[PDB]
Amino acid sequence: NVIQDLYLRELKDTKLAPSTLQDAEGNVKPWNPPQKPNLPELELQGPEALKAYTEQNVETAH
Amino acid sequence: RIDSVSQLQNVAETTKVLFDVSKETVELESEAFELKQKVELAHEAKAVLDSW
């Protein structure tokens, strides 16, 4: 009765209330990419270090 | 004197093993960096997706 009246009135006269996807974007964190793939620097590259190390520590093992 | 000598004998072979092993380990960490950038990208994506 009143159930029917409400059911009808409610459903018909506005089903959903307005919404916009564009507005949502502002209020949510946007995807942003990691910066740089990165490559590790060549650690202790070449015998520059070795020649230095042999001389630097010619320290024996006692 | 023999006692002093003996310690050094065992060291001489085995130390070459650790020397290599340490550098071998360092290589593994390089590859771990590749993982780290993967970890990051996923985390960022999950966070934005959570916000959505």
- Dihedral (Cα; A27, A33, A43, B24), 10-degree rounding: 100
Q: What is the residue type of B41? A: L
**What's the one-letter identity of residue A25?**
E
The two structure tokens encoding residue B42: 């996923």
Q: Which residues of A touch B37 (CB under 8 A)?
A: 34, 37-38
CA gap B47, A30 in Å, rounded: 9
Provide the experimental method for this PDB entry.
cryo-EM
Could you tell me which chain A residue has the CA closest to the CA of B26? A43
How far is C-alpha A35 from the geometric centre of its chain's CA atoms?
Answer: 10
In this structure, how many other beta carbons lie within 10 angstroms of the beta carbon of residue A31?
Answer: 13
Q: Distance (Å, rounded) from C-alpha B26 to C-alpha A48?
A: 19
Residues of A in contact with B51 (CB under 8 A): 28-29
Q: What's the CA gap between A34 and A37, in Å, rounded?
A: 8
- Written as one string, the DSSP assignment of chain A is -HHHHHHHHHHHH-SS----HHHHHHTSPPP---S-------TT-STHHHHHHHHH------
